[PDB]
Amino acid sequence: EEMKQIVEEQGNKLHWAALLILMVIIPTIGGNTLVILAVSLEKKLQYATNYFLMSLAVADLLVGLFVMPIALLTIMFEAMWPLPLVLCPAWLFLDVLFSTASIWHLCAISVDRYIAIKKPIQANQYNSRATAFIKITVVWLISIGIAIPVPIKGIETNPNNITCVLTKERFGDFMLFGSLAAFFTPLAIMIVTYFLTIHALQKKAADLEDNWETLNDNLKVIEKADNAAQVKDALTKMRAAALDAQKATPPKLEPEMKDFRHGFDILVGQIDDALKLANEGKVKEAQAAAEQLKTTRNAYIQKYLVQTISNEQRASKVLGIVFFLFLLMWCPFFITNITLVLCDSCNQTTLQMLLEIFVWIGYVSSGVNPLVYTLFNKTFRDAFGRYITCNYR
Ligand SMILES: CC(C)CCC[C@@H](C)[C@H]1CC[C@H]2[C@@H]3CC=C4C[C@@H](O)CC[C@]4(C)[C@H]3CC[C@]12C
Ligand SMILES: CCN(CC)C(=O)[C@@H]1C=C2c3cccc4[nH]cc(c34)C[C@H]2N(C)C1
């Protein structure tokens, strides 16, 4: 048809590209460099947890370095693909790869924190350097597999002109099941681990309270004991609970000030000595020793119990909120991407416009994610402050 009023010539969108550089691309590249430099040279930050965390910082750095800048060309020159043709499947592949790896890294981290709560007795038996490298490798294999349909299939190609996009027609299956594997599955897992963590912390605080009153009750049992035999087992009941309460937390392998967990080492040592008296038969002498156990209880143990529960609870809450924001900002993209495949009434043209926008809410979500996470750690936070002032020694 002929419509001369159809002056639908796309205006210049350079100001949006400049704003994504300033507000998204630079914070992504800068923020993940800091996290990488920190784990790299700051010798006090080099352990298993961070090597996995560094891997995440790498994935997010690669997003802002190879995915995000070429995504600007989607914006500057709206119609066509400026780069060579083989760069199109390469770019799309790197996009799905690095974006998926970031989401799955957080899923794994969540599981580790829950495991660290449930079973703190995992000192280099696992959660070591070998364990670190295995889960790093797996996450990448998962994200490689999810991303690999894109280059294997490719974008259809006559003129050597291509439009770099995943259409509903050609990648409908991938747009649907590729989102489930990359987002909604690690989302479901993180929802499950969330409630499991609440149960773990409540069950842990409960057990500690039981250990506490076990110590105190048996103290009165000892103090009010006329017989010898009931002193001996009242002491061994204390010894079991003390070890029980101590084992609800890793050793101080970890740390510059007081270590309340050491109180259990002292307490048990006193119990054993008092238990030697009970065996010899010196009951009156043993009861006096048991009264001295209270000094250890008042000094170390009482503060330890509130220390453990409060600290584990706190670290749990903040980790949940930051991981919640990550997922929440990735929500508008993947929900839209799904409805693009499952809704046939919606205008695909404008439903694609929302995709091209929501992807930047996700990009900045992945990009600044390790920074926001590491900033609640003092060693990282102090390291950053020295880096931004260009100080290395
Ligand atoms: C065209 C666009 C993408 C420019 C990219 C921005 C890059 C080149 C610039 C902008 C801000 C810069 C960062 C600013 C802060 C620091 C602290 C310094 O101790 C280490 C390098 C680091 C992390 C810089 C690395 C390079 C950096 C990320
Ligand atoms: C606006 C257009 N772009 C960029 C070219 C996308 O829609 C990208 C397509 C993706 C995508 C499609 C289909 C399945 C998937 N799993 C994981 C991703 C994914 C990542 C996801 N990236 C982040 C955006």
Curated annotation (Swiss-Prot):
Q: Where is this site: Hydrophobic barrier that decreases the speed of ligand binding and dissociation?
A: 166
Bilayer topology annotation: Multi-pass membrane protein
Name the reported effect of residue 356 to A.
Answer: No effect on agonist binding
Tell me the impact of changing residue 100 to V/A.
Decreased agonist binding
What are the transmembrane regions?
17-39, 51-73, 90-111, 132-152, 174-196, 318-338, 354-375
Tissues expressing this chain? Ubiquitous. Detected in liver, kidney, heart, pulmonary artery, and intestine. Detected at lower levels in blood, placenta and brain, especially in cerebellum, occipital cortex and frontal cortex.
Lipid-carrying residues in chain (S-palmitoyl cysteine): 390
Q: Which UniProt keywords apply?
A: Behavior, Cell membrane, Disulfide bond, G-protein coupled receptor, Glycoprotein, Lipoprotein, Membrane, Palmitate, Receptor, Synapse, Synaptosome, Transducer, Transmembrane, Transmembrane helix
* Locus of motif NPxxY motif: 369-373
GO terms (molecular function) for this protein are:
G protein-coupled serotonin receptor activity; G-protein alpha-subunit binding; Gq/11-coupled serotonin receptor activity; GTPase activator activity; neurotransmitter receptor activity; serotonin binding; serotonin receptor activity
Q: What is the effect of changing residue 355 to A?
A: No effect on agonist binding
The cysteines covalently paired via disulfide bonds are 88-164, 343-346
Q: Which GO terms describe its cellular component?
A: cytoplasm; dendrite; G protein-coupled serotonin receptor complex; nucleoplasm; plasma membrane; synapse
* Record annotation: effect of changing residue 166 to A: No effect on agonist binding. Strongly increases dissociation of bound lysergic acid diethylamine, without affecting binding affinity
Topological domains, Cytoplasmic: 40-50, 112-131
Motif DRY motif: which ranges? 112-114
Residues that, per the record, bind ergotamine: 95, 100, 166
Can you quote the domain comment?
Ligands are bound in a hydrophobic pocket formed by the transmembrane helices.
Protein function = G-protein coupled receptor for 5-hydroxytryptamine (serotonin). Also functions as a receptor for various ergot alkaloid derivatives and psychoactive substances. Ligand binding causes a conformation change that triggers signaling via guanine nucleotide-binding proteins (G proteins) and modulates the activity of downstream effectors.
More info: Binds lysergic acid diethylamine (LSD) in the orthosteric pocket, but is not the principal LSD receptor in the brain. Bound LSD dissociates extremely slowly, with a residence time of about 46 minutes at 37 degrees Celsius.
Complexes and interactors: Interacts (via C-terminus) with MPDZ.
Its name, as the record gives it, is 5-hydroxytryptamine receptor 2B
Organism equals Homo sapiens
